[PDB]
Design an enzyme around this catalytic site. Structure first.
Site, PDB file in Angstrom:
ATOM      1  N   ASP A  25     100.281 -61.702 -10.368  1.00  0.00           N
ATOM      2  CA  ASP A  25     100.019 -63.126 -10.404  1.00  0.00           C
ATOM      3  C   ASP A  25     100.016 -63.769  -9.019  1.00  0.00           C
ATOM      4  O   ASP A  25     101.051 -64.140  -8.466  1.00  0.00           O
ATOM      5  CB  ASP A  25     101.070 -63.770 -11.297  1.00  0.00           C
ATOM      6  CG  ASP A  25     100.785 -65.218 -11.642  1.00  0.00           C
ATOM      7  OD1 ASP A  25      99.809 -65.741 -11.050  1.00  0.00           O
ATOM      8  OD2 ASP A  25     101.505 -65.757 -12.430  1.00  0.00           O
ATOM      9  N   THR A  26      98.823 -63.905  -8.419  1.00  0.00           N
ATOM     10  CA  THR A  26      98.711 -64.521  -7.096  1.00  0.00           C
ATOM     11  C   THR A  26      99.062 -65.988  -7.102  1.00  0.00           C
ATOM     12  O   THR A  26      99.324 -66.532  -6.012  1.00  0.00           O
ATOM     13  CB  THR A  26      97.299 -64.321  -6.532  1.00  0.00           C
ATOM     14  OG1 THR A  26      96.331 -64.930  -7.394  1.00  0.00           O
ATOM     15  CG2 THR A  26      97.001 -62.857  -6.343  1.00  0.00           C
ATOM     16  N   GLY A  27      99.102 -66.630  -8.257  1.00  0.00           N
ATOM     17  CA  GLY A  27      99.532 -68.005  -8.386  1.00  0.00           C
ATOM     18  C   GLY A  27     101.018 -68.198  -8.533  1.00  0.00           C
ATOM     19  O   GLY A  27     101.447 -69.339  -8.747  1.00  0.00           O
TER      20      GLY A  27
HETATM   21  C1  Y9N Z   1      94.605 -70.556 -20.372  1.00  0.00           C
HETATM   22  O1  Y9N Z   1      94.624 -70.732 -18.971  1.00  0.00           O
HETATM   23  C2  Y9N Z   1      95.825 -70.918 -18.347  1.00  0.00           C
HETATM   24  C3  Y9N Z   1      97.058 -70.849 -19.014  1.00  0.00           C
HETATM   25  C4  Y9N Z   1      98.215 -70.983 -18.264  1.00  0.00           C
HETATM   26  C5  Y9N Z   1      98.170 -71.218 -16.898  1.00  0.00           C
HETATM   27  S1  Y9N Z   1      99.636 -71.239 -15.978  1.00  0.00           S
HETATM   28  O2  Y9N Z   1     100.705 -71.555 -16.845  1.00  0.00           O
HETATM   29  O3  Y9N Z   1      99.427 -72.044 -14.841  1.00  0.00           O
HETATM   30  N1  Y9N Z   1     100.001 -69.741 -15.479  1.00  0.00           N
HETATM   31  C6  Y9N Z   1     100.160 -68.698 -16.550  1.00  0.00           C
HETATM   32  C7  Y9N Z   1     101.288 -67.684 -16.185  1.00  0.00           C
HETATM   33  C8  Y9N Z   1     102.650 -68.398 -16.091  1.00  0.00           C
HETATM   34  C9  Y9N Z   1     101.253 -66.609 -17.240  1.00  0.00           C
HETATM   35  C10 Y9N Z   1      99.382 -69.273 -14.210  1.00  0.00           C
HETATM   36  C11 Y9N Z   1     100.468 -69.019 -13.126  1.00  0.00           C
HETATM   37  O4  Y9N Z   1      99.932 -68.386 -11.972  1.00  0.00           O
HETATM   38  C12 Y9N Z   1     101.198 -70.338 -12.686  1.00  0.00           C
HETATM   39  C13 Y9N Z   1     100.318 -71.210 -11.789  1.00  0.00           C
HETATM   40  C14 Y9N Z   1     101.106 -72.467 -11.411  1.00  0.00           C
HETATM   41  C15 Y9N Z   1     101.843 -72.498 -10.219  1.00  0.00           C
HETATM   42  C16 Y9N Z   1     102.605 -73.599  -9.916  1.00  0.00           C
HETATM   43  F1  Y9N Z   1     103.328 -73.574  -8.789  1.00  0.00           F
HETATM   44  C17 Y9N Z   1     102.700 -74.659 -10.755  1.00  0.00           C
HETATM   45  C18 Y9N Z   1     101.988 -74.598 -11.922  1.00  0.00           C
HETATM   46  F2  Y9N Z   1     102.099 -75.635 -12.783  1.00  0.00           F
HETATM   47  C19 Y9N Z   1     101.200 -73.557 -12.276  1.00  0.00           C
HETATM   48  N2  Y9N Z   1     102.446 -69.977 -12.010  1.00  0.00           N
HETATM   49  C20 Y9N Z   1     103.573 -70.578 -12.283  1.00  0.00           C
HETATM   50  O5  Y9N Z   1     103.638 -71.392 -13.194  1.00  0.00           O
HETATM   51  C21 Y9N Z   1     104.754 -70.257 -11.448  1.00  0.00           C
HETATM   52  C22 Y9N Z   1     105.127 -68.979 -11.186  1.00  0.00           C
HETATM   53  C23 Y9N Z   1     106.340 -68.694 -10.516  1.00  0.00           C
HETATM   54  C24 Y9N Z   1     107.162 -69.746 -10.127  1.00  0.00           C
HETATM   55  C25 Y9N Z   1     108.449 -69.448  -9.387  1.00  0.00           C
HETATM   56  C26 Y9N Z   1     106.784 -71.044 -10.419  1.00  0.00           C
HETATM   57  N3  Y9N Z   1     107.473 -72.172 -10.008  1.00  0.00           N
HETATM   58  C27 Y9N Z   1     107.861 -72.527  -8.798  1.00  0.00           C
HETATM   59  N4  Y9N Z   1     107.618 -71.775  -7.695  1.00  0.00           N
HETATM   60  C28 Y9N Z   1     108.234 -72.103  -6.531  1.00  0.00           C
HETATM   61  C29 Y9N Z   1     109.011 -73.238  -6.428  1.00  0.00           C
HETATM   62  C30 Y9N Z   1     109.109 -74.008  -7.524  1.00  0.00           C
HETATM   63  C31 Y9N Z   1     109.957 -75.240  -7.473  1.00  0.00           C
HETATM   64  C32 Y9N Z   1     111.060 -75.326  -6.597  1.00  0.00           C
HETATM   65  C33 Y9N Z   1     111.817 -76.484  -6.542  1.00  0.00           C
HETATM   66  C34 Y9N Z   1     111.451 -77.510  -7.378  1.00  0.00           C
HETATM   67  N5  Y9N Z   1     110.416 -77.406  -8.216  1.00  0.00           N
HETATM   68  C35 Y9N Z   1     109.673 -76.302  -8.271  1.00  0.00           C
HETATM   69  N6  Y9N Z   1     108.587 -73.622  -8.689  1.00  0.00           N
HETATM   70  C36 Y9N Z   1     105.604 -71.307 -11.128  1.00  0.00           C
HETATM   71  C37 Y9N Z   1      96.925 -71.254 -16.255  1.00  0.00           C
HETATM   72  C38 Y9N Z   1      95.772 -71.144 -16.990  1.00  0.00           C
END
Ligand code: Y9N
Ligand code: CL
Ligand code: CL
Ligand code: CL
Ligand code: CL
Ligand code: NA
Lengths: 99, 99
Positions: A25-27
């Site tokens: 997951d590059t996202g």
């Molecule tokens: C059908 O089509 C779709 C269905 C679903 C999606 S999705 O849900 O977006 N998702 C699905 C997977 C989870 C399976 C894609 C995934 O790459 C998502 C993309 C994303 C990133 C983000 F970034 C905020 C977002 F919405 C969304 N990754 C995480 O949610 C992500 C993955 C890992 C982490 C650690 C975090 N959160 C994160 N990261 C660093 C710091 C913080 C943070 C730190 C302090 C305060 N607040 C937040 N949070 C978020 C997309 C298309």
């Protein structure tokens, strides 16, 4: 390998002796795994996704194999919908995006 | 290009006559963009991830330019924290993950 994206980029990982499926997951900044037992102490972390925030447990310096490639690094454990391998470990295995 | 994963893989897109920054996201099945207007028909959808579900509008047959590369496909519009280019469009620009 060269992984195309017509299907989800699912791989096998090995963590705690056990094989699991996970999404490359590059996202994802960080790696997040479903509830499991890991050794050592954990620290708190809040992560935000598409639907809102979840609390996770942060374990550092965990041995984990990804598609046969060995890594040692941080694993977050909590109520993620799917196991996700994020950039912290994608960089350890030498992954890039190419087009 | 080859994009390393030391930082978030952000690119400029052009969609609906607007420039936006978006994340190249191999973990996203579909492309999800913050609130904007698009032409044509749409239907409602729920999509889920970390933290639960959001409601989006699904627009089909939308052209986009992603880091200079054109494609066409479905775009979901709604209250996403980040603009996401998902696999449905990454395939069209020939993106692969390599390690
Ligand atoms: C059908 O089509 C779709 C269905 C679903 C999606 S999705 O849900 O977006 N998702 C699905 C997977 C989870 C399976 C894609 C995934 O790459 C998502 C993309 C994303 C990133 C983000 F970034 C905020 C977002 F919405 C969304 N990754 C995480 O949610 C992500 C993955 C890992 C982490 C650690 C975090 N959160 C994160 N990261 C660093 C710091 C913080 C943070 C730190 C302090 C305060 N607040 C937040 N949070 C978020 C997309 C298309
Ligand atoms: Cl594929
Ligand atoms: Cl790490
Ligand atoms: Cl599509
Ligand atoms: Cl192909
Ligand atoms: Na349409």
């Amino acid at each position: 390998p060269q992984i195309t994206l017509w299907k989800r980029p699912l791989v096998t990982i090995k963590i705690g002796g056990q094989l699991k499926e996970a999404l490359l997951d590059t996202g994802a900044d960080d790696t997040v795994i479903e509830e499991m037992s890991l050794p050592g102490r954990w620290k708190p972390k809040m992560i935000g996704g598409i639907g809102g925030f979840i609390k996770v447990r942060q374990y550092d310096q965990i041995i984990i194999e990804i598609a046969g490639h060995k890594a040692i690094g941080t694993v977050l454990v909590g109520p993620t919908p799917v196991n996700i391998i994020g950039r912290n470990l994608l960089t350890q295995i030498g992954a890039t995006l190419n087009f």
